[PDB]
Amino acid sequence: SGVEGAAFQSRLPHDRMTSQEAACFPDIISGPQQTQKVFLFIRNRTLQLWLDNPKIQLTFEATLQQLEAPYNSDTVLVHRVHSYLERHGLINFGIYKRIKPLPTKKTGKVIIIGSGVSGLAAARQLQSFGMDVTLLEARDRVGGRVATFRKGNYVADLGAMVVTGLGGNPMAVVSKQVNMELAKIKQKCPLYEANGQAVPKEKDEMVEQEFNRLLEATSYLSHQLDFNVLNNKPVSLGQALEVVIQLQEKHVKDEQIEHWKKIVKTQEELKELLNKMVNLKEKIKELHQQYKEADITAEFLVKSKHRDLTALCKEYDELAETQGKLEEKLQELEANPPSDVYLSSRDRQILDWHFANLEFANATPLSTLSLKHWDQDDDFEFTGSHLTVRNGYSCVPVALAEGLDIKLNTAVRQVRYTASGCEVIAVNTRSTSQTFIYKCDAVLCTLPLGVLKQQPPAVQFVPPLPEWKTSAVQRMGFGNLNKVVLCFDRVFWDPSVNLFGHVGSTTASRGELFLFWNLYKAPILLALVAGEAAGIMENISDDVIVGRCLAILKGIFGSSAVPQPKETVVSRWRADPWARGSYSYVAAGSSGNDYDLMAQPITPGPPIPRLFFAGEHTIRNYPATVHGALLSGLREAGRIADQFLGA
Ligand SMILES: [C]C1=C([C])[C]=C2C(=[C]1)N([C][C]([O])[C]([O])[C]([O])[C]OP([O])(=O)OP([O])(=O)O[C][C]1O[C](N3[C]=NC4=C3N=[C]N=C4[N])[C]([O])[C]1[O])C1=NC(=O)[N]C(=O)C1=N2[C]([C][C]=O)C1=C(O[C]C2=C(F)N=[C][C]=[C]2)C(F)=[C]C(F)=[C]1
């Protein structure tokens, strides 16, 4: 349905109040049920009005005007609901035409560190709420871990580049507002072995289905058997994977043993049986000789010796009958061996390709992920097909930047917060002699976790952060993932496939250039560097890594089919001081709860909060994503406005 659809699109149950709404509307939860149903219709219809046309601000007046009777009659309640939705960024978020121009007198000074999606989303909220917002951004550009390369006809994203399902996804709103050109991804993904030979379909399917099996098995180990701590250490996904593969190999070796025992037993029965038939031939040779030696006792001696001879001959023909049913059991046993090994060398390499795919998805080696919690956010996936931003994901943050007071090339070095306000200190990256001091009432820190982890610190906090926050920083994972962009003047690959795989030759290097993407109008290929390879490869010059790309591609399509690229780009997210990695992951020994601790504001001791946190690493249910970063900016904007303008 329509207004039910709007609730779903807002990640809300269409037919009950959230706890958050119960808090803000206690008169509703404690009042009659009829009024609670009225409340929910107001909420859903208001969201529909916004979502049907997110390019313009949805005001209270226009909501009241578009409500049908009797709902447009409870004016006070309509306003209460509108105000709540707006404050929490469920309407009038993103970029839209303001009907009410911005208030000319501001209220409170907020410094936002970082002009990524989380910083931009919060800034637009706080500016709409009437506050004085200034963003300090170290790079010469907005977008942070959204980073679009453009040169000639080439456009390619070096950071984020995929919108997961639009159903429930706030990026669906931003897409409509900004005009992102999105394009659904075709799912076919052929694999090529390291010699460039295609992986046959049967081997592709066999290994993939086994991959699914192994992983489901780790999840049974974890969440049914509670195999989560071992020898006083938290178990990693990689560790569990090594364990379940070891058990499959044990099982294979056992069925092999059982089968060899069956072989041996059959051979032994034949040896014995042949010895017995041997002696029975010898016994018949003796009776057959006493049959030619042959009176009344002679006429009866032949009858008796024929009775004896042909009785031994029946013993012998019946034993050659067993001889046949046995060497017939033997022949098919030698012809039906169970698998010699669990994974052929090629089978193992292909399986390592699927592992690399998972290390791509989590941006970190599997041996680092928490076995128990690495996919704790699975239950929050959006519905619908995934898409890529054909026109470059920077269109989103660039659009969000319009009208904001953003100081680029401005690197924060120190953040001071007291019960009397805050001071942020920064340097000009083009002239690190030039220094700036920003006084403010509140700081919103959207520095990446990688920057927060940096030792010695890039940014110094005064007073230092509390142990519960720094130890959460210490526990959490911050991964890495890199891309090689190859721009050609001609298309030599299969244009109808968005993906194809290169099966690495070894486990340790399974993530090197393992997956190629074909996603754009023009001839562009992205090659991914995942897992252990991701950090190590940053130490390779551009030209050499491109050469390795080209060698792979020449192996797949032929040496003369692959021309020299006209333009190349190589991400190095770990070495980037403004990222120091790509995005968080749930490290073994961490959990979603660390994401909640990351979101928690700091209050200087006896008082009111001064230092706030946003970014993909602060949102438990949507970490490591653009929409999660976005939502986190909206969340903190609500928290800060509640503090400085009143709930
Ligand atoms: C890196 C990366 C990559 C490479 C990729 C990707 C990513 C990443 N992702 C993630 C995102 O992006 C995130 O989450 C966001 O971005 C966040 O944001 P924030 O929070 O805001 O942060 P930033 O941005 O960084 O910001 C901050 C700021 O700050 C600053 N600074 C620093 N330092 C300093 C400063 N300032 C001042 N001072 C100082 N000192 C900086 O600069 C900044 O600005 C993503 N996401 C999403 O959503 N999507 C996508 O797509 C993405 N990605 C990926 C990964 C994984 O896997 C993904 C995917 O994949 C896709 C693909 C690719 F990429 N390629 C090819 C093919 C495919 C998927 F599918 C999904 C997902 F989910 C993800």
From Swiss-Prot:
GO terms for cellular component: chromatin; chromosome, telomeric region; DNA repair complex; histone methyltransferase complex; nucleoplasm; nucleus; protein-containing complex; transcription regulator complex. There is a cross-link at residue 271 (Glycyl lysine isopeptide (Lys-Gly) (interchain with G-Cter in SUMO2)). It catalyses: N(6),N(6)-dimethyl-L-lysyl(4)-[histone H3] + 2 A + 2 H2O = L-lysyl(4)-[histone H3] + 2 formaldehyde + 2 AH2. It is linked to Cleft palate, psychomotor retardation, and distinctive facial features: A syndrome characterized by cleft palate, developmental delay, psychomotor retardation, and facial dysmorphic features including a prominent forehead, slightly arched eyebrows, elongated palpebral fissures, a wide nasal bridge, thin lips, and widely spaced teeth. Cleft palate is a congenital fissure of the soft and/or hard palate, due to faulty fusion. ACTH-independent macronodular adrenal hyperplasia 3: A form of macronodular adrenal hyperplasia, a rare adrenal defect characterized by multiple, bilateral, non-pigmented, benign, adrenocortical nodules. It results in excessive production of cortisol leading to ACTH-independent Cushing syndrome. Clinical manifestations of Cushing syndrome include facial and truncal obesity, abdominal striae, muscular weakness, osteoporosis, arterial hypertension, diabetes. AIMAH3 affected individuals have low fasting cortisol and ACTH, but excess cortisol is secreted after eating. Residues 129-647 are annotated as: Demethylase activity. The gene is KDM1A. The keyword Electron transport does not apply. Histone demethylase that can demethylate both 'Lys-4' (H3K4me) and 'Lys-9' (H3K9me) of histone H3, thereby acting as a coactivator or a corepressor, depending on the context. Acts by oxidizing the substrate by FAD to generate the corresponding imine that is subsequently hydrolyzed. Acts as a corepressor by mediating demethylation of H3K4me, a specific tag for epigenetic transcriptional activation. Demethylates both mono- (H3K4me1) and di-methylated (H3K4me2) H3K4me. May play a role in the repression of neuronal genes. This is Lysine-specific histone demethylase 1A. The modification N6-acetyllysine is found at residues 261-262, 265. FAD binds at residues 118, 137, 139, 145, 161-162, 616, 625-626. Induction: Down-regulated during neural differentiation in neuroblastoma cancer. GO terms for molecular function: chromatin binding; DNA-binding transcription factor binding; enzyme binding; FAD-dependent H3K4me/H3K4me3 demethylase activity; flavin adenine dinucleotide binding; histone demethylase activity; histone H3K4 demethylase activity; histone H3K9 demethylase activity. Component of a histone demethylase complex with RCOR1. Component of a RCOR/GFI/KDM1A/HDAC complex. Interacts directly with GFI1 and GFI1B. Interacts with INSM1 (via N-terminus). Component of a BHC histone deacetylase complex that contains HDAC1, HDAC2, HMG20B, KDM1A, RCOR1 and PHF21A. The BHC complex may also contain ZMYM2, ZNF217, ZMYM3, GSE1 and GTF2I. In the complex, RCOR1/CoREST strongly enhances the demethylase activity and protects it from the proteasome while PHF21A/BHC80 inhibits the demethylase activity. Interacts with the androgen receptor (AR). Changing residue 118 to P: In AIMAH3; uncertain significance. Residues 257-336 form a coiled coil. The keyword Nucleus applies. There is a cross-link at residue 325 (Glycyl lysine isopeptide (Lys-Gly) (interchain with G-Cter in ubiquitin)). One of its GO terms (biological process) is positive regulation of transcription by RNA polymerase II. Keywords: Acetylation, Chromatin regulator, Chromosome, Coiled coil, Cushing syndrome, Developmental protein, Disease variant, FAD, Flavoprotein, Isopeptide bond, Nucleus, Oxidoreductase, Phosphoprotein, Repressor, Transcription, Transcription regulation, Ubl conjugation. The N-terminal sequences of INSM1 and SNAI1 compete with histone H3 for the same binding site and thereby inhibit histone demethylation (in vitro). Belongs to the flavin monoamine oxidase family. The SWIRM domain may act as an anchor site for a histone tail.
